[PDB]
Design a protein around this ligand. Structure first.
Ligand code: CA
Ligand code: CA
Ligand code: ZN
Length: 1287
């Protein structure tokens, strides 16, 4: 158990637990400090830390010590005894809060027992030397009047009050002759500058801190966690493992980059959480090795130590025993000390990954920042930590009895205001970057708001070095984690060995290196005329001395006029916001513009499913103009084209080393070692893959995700500014009225602000998801594949290497040299799948990942789309696409393959996308229109199979071919074994849904089946378990190839590939998404047009058509003629028959050229009678359920309705549409729908039934039934002449 001593600042000196100490950095001169022993080996000195600081530095000046801290100054802190005593009592409570839990008590116990080795690098191995400034510190025994008697003592930790900057807590170790004992295994006296009342403030952007913009957002820190954070550094320092290694260093070549001090891996380990992942596994191991090496040096000293000259009273055994336990060395029955790998490993992990701020915060239920790389904010002052009404040893601020326990409400700035006070900005110092334009207006930006981007130098190149594979060689992995529960329950973790006496001989060699600090300018100017994020956000603010503003979509005016504020919301929203109204209409207006705000903010949930993009926040580009001029042009389009990478302010130069070559150890005649060797090189190869991935994740987190975090923050600020601006306008407008008018104006600013705030929170969530999705997208498509390339390159080089090896030893491999020849190939075969959770256990990151991977659209490895008269791949994987001259394309994303040699498309697929699941698992989807066979060429049509899409590599692959009325899918495994599945549509039907008609195809493949889907429905299946490997990433060729007729062609649209098997659900869903359009379709499936001749088809009367009756102004219904010629293979009904209709537009007399017919349009339905154009009418006064339509010349009789509204009642994809007659555009009185009705006719000679072109009210209720009755006689389709259909 740990004992926390008690005392008052005025208690008298006793030279034991209360002394006059001579601090290490005083170099043995200067005055002493009243020091209090709070526990063994730990001292508290309630005075300001002055070593290395000028006295005036304690005042706020025009400078700053650290560029990334809102520094608070106060030279009066601790300038009295009562203050010093308060400081003491406060420290006592914090230490008490700390040991209040097992985890904290152990940290304290580990620290107390982690006494520094007696000596350092300069000391001889056979000796213990206490006479160095990292081991002994002196205390003055003498009477106040002389330094006559000084005594030396051993100490582990000395804690002072803060230096010039109150909120800049720090742990310092002792350097002597340019070396640090605490960094080389010995350990040494640790010091700390600490301030308990002025704690840091932080807030999680992805989360809602009270979810109120008009209120204080954020959380303040539990000073006990802050202290435990520093105590972790102390623990590292004491055990001598606070080693230096390759640091994370920020790139600063660009003005938008954040400037900050280099960050050592130890710093990130201390914080824990995601941060350790920024330290590559490479460096992780480098550090592990350095520490191990340091321990080897100590264990060797223990086996050599003989005497201690410095203190003749030191008991060598007592210390050898203590140090043995400290470092967990093992001693044989003979007394020989040696390093035990298990014990070391566990001890190392415990100190670097067990004791972390993250793990501790979690155990003590204390809330803290998300990552070391989180924007710092202005600190707040806790009112009184000594008041149990506000802060307790057991719960800190989150006191349950006060209901401040849930959701860390006790640390919530908006909820626990009685706990703290805001700080006088007048005393805060903040490093700023002043961006001036070469002219000239200037903008100040906090160095915090810039983009932190790790320079390439931050990462290890170790992967590029050679490796020696020997029968004994083994893998190397360091899990950046540690089971906190076992750490807490570890029985032998805490020493049970006697702590030696702290009294020793006085220190006489005061040699030590003292740091010297100095401020630097708090403002750094830079010149740039760039109008990126910083400017855009700026243009959205206004001066405090200005209260009358106006919104404007002009970024340039906003900058030029203080009364002008930029808004990235809609033109309409902007106009309404600047409107001015009568007091009596003000309330209406307030409700209107506020609701409008929420609408605009909510556009953050926009979907773009047709472009295979689920979520997109359209206004991000206008709001920040971040990355590549994202404020110009249409953002959504730009995004569809280049994706996530267009949002980045800078594209990072990744470090992807060529994996060092392997060197295997040969063992002549030894059939065992030779094999081991081989096996090992294999395993090692896998370690190389993992290490490479970690290297990637590390760079992604510190150069990419960091930028995206900056963007999410920028959006939060942008949205906040918009609300503030609107609020400003509202207040201004309202205050223009008289008190009398105001009294009668019903307005509740609390509901307004609540409305805004809510709309913002919704938008923030959408924005956060969109951005995380982008980040993960960039990782997986722009980073990972490049690592895969070099990793596969490595594999190959290793492949021959291994073979050539087995080769040379085949002798000593005799009758087994074979069983391993394959063993090698079959290993370097199946590669390693990337798994984020392997390099981190951060909940947020893991979830981002799983979310991404659970979105089918991300399984798209090829998506050919039309753009600026050209087909490009928008999968994001960069496939190269060559579209040759003979290929015709349109902006309808339709492309045509002809019989010409140059009607061809070549796709060079990305070779670095994992596509070899090792069982075949992928899908292909596309729309197609296959022309009808030539009646005189039917034999060749059914006989000649021709390839349309071929993807082969080494006589293995897949292909789509066609033989007449049959489309075929074929696979060839590496052995030449083939399998196919096909879909054949019937060519003997009166009317076909497929011939010359656009239809959706989808082919799925999995270890067991090959399935063909047509329009969302499954049509064919083939068992493919037999098929072996199938190379599928070879070149893809789109071209007709086979004995085809010269007139043969094929139309294709939306060709795409997924590296997985699509479910019936996904397929049905893709069918619907791609079928959608505002416009109606024609019989063939192309968009319906105005001023285009069409024959009419009836879905309810397939073999019926319309003809003008000879003696009557009506349309009679005749039976379609059918295929005349003979042949046992074909049969169909003629389509180019009946009257030739033409759809005419209604409003806008902008001539009658042409255009697209959209659902709900009003039209005239005409047809050609000889040289004239007639029209279809309805007698307004028919009284029966149905009426025969009136067909006559164009005129405007008041007895006939002539206006028709085209409709779509079917909610599922269809080429049918319906025609409605309504009183007039306005009226909601539906006269009826156009269809066909049966009539009984009995003349003097003939007696029969005869169908007519009618209008009918019966259809009105029928079209509402579900499912939609496709057979309804009111379902029509328009057939225009098409080269794909001849009769
Ligand atoms: Ca790591
Ligand atoms: Ca302005
Ligand atoms: Zn730290």
């Amino acid at each position: 158990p740990v004992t926390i001593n008690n005392f008052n600042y005025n208690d008298p000196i006793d030279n034991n637990n209360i002394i006059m100490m001579e601090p290490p950095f005083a170099r043995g001169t200067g005055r002493y400090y009243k020091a209090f022993k709070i526990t063994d080996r730990i001292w508290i000195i309630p005075e300001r830390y002055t070593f290395g600081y000028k006295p005036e530095d304690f005042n706020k000046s025009s400078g700053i010590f650290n560029r990334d801290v809102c520094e608070y100054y106060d030279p009066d802190y601790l300038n009295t005894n009562d203050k010093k005593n308060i400081f003491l009592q406060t420290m006592i409570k914090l230490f008490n809060r700390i040991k209040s839990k097992p985890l904290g008590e152990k940290l304290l116990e580990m620290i107390i027992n982690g006494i520094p080795y007696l000596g350092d690098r300069r000391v001889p191995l056979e000796e213990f030397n206490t006479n160095i400034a990292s081991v002994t510190v002196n205390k003055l025994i003498s009477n106040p009047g002389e330094v006559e008697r000084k005594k030396g003592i051993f100490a582990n930790l000395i804690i002072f009050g803060p230096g010039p900057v109150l909120n800049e807590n720090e742990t310092i170790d002792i350097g002597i002759q340019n070396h640090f004992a605490s960094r080389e295994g010995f350990g040494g006296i640790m010091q700390m500058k600490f301030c308990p009342e002025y704690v840091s403030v932080f807030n999680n952007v992805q989360e809602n801190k009270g979810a109120s913009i008009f209120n204080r957002r954020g959380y303040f820190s539990d000073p006990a966690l802050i202290l435990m954070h520093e105590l972790i550094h102390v623990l590292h320092g004491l055990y001598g493992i606070k080693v230096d290694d390759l640091p994370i260093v920020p790139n600063e070549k660009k003005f938008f980059m954040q400037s900050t001090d280099a960050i050592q891996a130890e710093e990130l380990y201390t914080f824990g959480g995601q941060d350790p992942s920024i330290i590559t596994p490479s460096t992780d191991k480098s550090i592990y090795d350095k520490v191990l090496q340091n321990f080897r040096g100590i264990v060797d000293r223990l086996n050599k130590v003989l005497v201690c000259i410095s203190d003749p009273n030191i008991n060598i055994n007592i210390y050898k025993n203590k140090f043995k336990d400290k470092y967990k060395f093992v001693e044989d029955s003979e007394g020989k000390y040696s390093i035990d790998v298990e014990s070391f490993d566990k001890l190392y992990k415990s100190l670097m990954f067990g004791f972390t701020e993250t793990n501790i915060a979690e155990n003590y239920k204390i809330k803290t920042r998300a990552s070391y790389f989180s924007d710092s904010l202005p600190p707040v002052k806790i009112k009184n930590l000594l008041d149990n009404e506000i802060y307790t040893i057991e719960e800190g601020f989150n006191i349950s009895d006060k209901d401040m326990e849930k959701e860390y409400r006790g640390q919530n700035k908006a909820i626990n205001k009685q706990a703290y006070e805001e700080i006088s900005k007048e005393h805060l110092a903040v490093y700023k970057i002043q961006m001036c334009k070469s002219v000239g207006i200037c903008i100040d930006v906090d160095n915090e708001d810039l983009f932190f981007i790790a320079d390439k130098n931050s990462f290890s190149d170790d992967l590029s070095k050679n490796e020696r594979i020997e029968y004994n060689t083994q893998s190397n992995y360091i899990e950046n984690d540690f089971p906190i529960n076992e750490l807490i329950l570890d029985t032998d973790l805490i020493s049970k060995i006697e702590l030696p006496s702290e009294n020793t001989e006085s220190l006489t060699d005061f040699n030590v290196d003292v740091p010297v600090y100095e401020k630097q300018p708090a403002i750094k100017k830079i010149f740039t005329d760039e109008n990126t994020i910083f400017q855009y956000l700026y243009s959205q603010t206004f001066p405090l001395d200005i209260r009358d503003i106006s919104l404007t979509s002009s970024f340039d005016d906003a900058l030029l006029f203080s009364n002008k504020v930029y808004s990235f919301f809609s033109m309409d929203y902007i106009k309404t916001a600047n409107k001015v109204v009568e007091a009596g209409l003000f309330a209406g207006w307030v409700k209107q513009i506020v609701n409008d705000f929420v609408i605009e903010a909510n556009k953050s949930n926009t979907m773009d499913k047709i472009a295979d993009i689920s979520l997109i926040v359209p206004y991000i580009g206008l709001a920040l103009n971040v990355g590549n001029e994202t404020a110009k042009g249409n953002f959504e389009n730009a995004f569809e084209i280049a994706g996530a990478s267009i949002l980045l302010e800078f594209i990072p130069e990744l470090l992807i080393p060529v994996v060092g070559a392997f060197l295997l150890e040969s063992y002549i005649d030894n059939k065992n070692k030779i094999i081991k060797t081989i096996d090992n090189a294999l395993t090692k190869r896998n370690e190389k893959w993992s290490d490479m991935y970690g290297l990637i994740v590390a760079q992604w987190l510190s150069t990419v995700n960091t930028q995206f975090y900056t963007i999410k923050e920028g959006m939060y600020k942008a949205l906040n500014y918009q609300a503030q601006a609107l609020e400003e306008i509202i207040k201004y407008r309202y205050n223009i009225y008289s008190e009398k008018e105001k009294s009668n104006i019903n307005i509740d600013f609390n509901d307004i602000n609540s409305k805004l705030n809510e709309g913002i929170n919704q938008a923030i969530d959408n924005i956060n998801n969109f951005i995380n999705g982008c980040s993960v997208s960039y990782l997986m498509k722009k980073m990972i594949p490049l690592a895969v390339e070099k990793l596969l390159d490595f594999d190959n080089t290793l492949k021959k290497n291994l073979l050539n090896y087995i080769d040379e030893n085949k002798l000593y491999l005799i009758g087994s040299a074979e069983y391993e020849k394959s063993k090698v190939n079959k290993y370097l075969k199946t590669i390693m799948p990337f798994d984020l959770s392997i390099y981190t256990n951060d909940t947020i990151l893991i979830e981002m990942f799983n979310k991404y991977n659970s979105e089918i659209l991300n399984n798209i490895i090829l998506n050919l789309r039309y753009k600026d008269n050209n087909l490009i791949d928008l999968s994001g994987y960069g496939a190269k696409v060559e579209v040759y001259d003979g290929v015709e394309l349109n902006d309808k994303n339709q492309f045509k393959l002809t019989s010409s040699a140059n009607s061809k498309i070549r796709v060079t697929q990305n070779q670095n996308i994992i596509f070899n699941s090792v069982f075949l698992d992928f899908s292909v989807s596309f729309w197609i229109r296959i022309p009808k066979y030539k009646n005189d060429g039917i034999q060749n049509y059914i006989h000649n199979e021709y390839t349309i899409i071929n993807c082969m590599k080494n006589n293995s692959g897949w292909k789509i071919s066609i033989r007449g009325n049959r489309i075929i899918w074929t696979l060839i495994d590496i052995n030449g074994k083939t399998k196919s599945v096909f879909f054949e549509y019937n060519i003997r039907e009166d009317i076909s849904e497929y011939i010359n008609r656009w239809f959706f195809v989808t082919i799925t493949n999995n270890l067991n089946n090959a399935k063909i889907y047509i329009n969302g429905k499954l049509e064919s299946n083939t068992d493919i378990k037999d098929i072996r490997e199938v190379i599928a990433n070879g070149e893809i060729i789109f071209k007709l190839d086979g004995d085809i007729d010269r007139t043969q062609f094929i139309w294709m649209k939306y060709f795409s590939i997924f590296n997985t098997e699509l479910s019936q659900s996904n397929i049905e869903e893709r069918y619907k998404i791609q079928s959608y359009s505002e416009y109606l379709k024609d019989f063939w499936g192309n968009p319906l047009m105005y001023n285009k001749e069409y024959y009419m088809f009836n879905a309810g009367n397939k073999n019926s058509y319309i003809k003008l009756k000879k003696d009557s102004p009506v349309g009679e219904i005749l039976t379609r003629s059918k295929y005349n010629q003979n042949s046992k293979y074909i049969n169909y009904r003629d389509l180019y028959i009946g009257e030739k209709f033409i759809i005419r537009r209604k409003s806008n007399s902008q001539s009658i050229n042409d255009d697209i017919v959209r659902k709900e349009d009003y039209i005239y339905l005409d047809f050609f009678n000889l040289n004239q154009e007639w029209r279809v009418y309805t007698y307004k006064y028919f009284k029966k359920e149905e009426e025969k339509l009136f067909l006559a010349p164009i005129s405007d009789s008041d007895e006939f309705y002539n206006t028709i509204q085209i409709k779509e009642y079917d909610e599922q994809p269809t080429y049918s549409c319906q025609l409605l007659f309504k009183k007039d555009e306005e009226s909601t009185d539906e006269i009826g729908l156009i269809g066909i009705h049966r009539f009984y006719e009995s003349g003097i000679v003939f007696e029969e039934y005869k169908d007519y072109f009618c209008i009918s009210k019966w259809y009105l209720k029928e079209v509402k039934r579900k499912p939609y009755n496709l057979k309804l006689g009111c379902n029509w389709q328009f057939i225009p002449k098409d080269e794909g259909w001849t009769e």
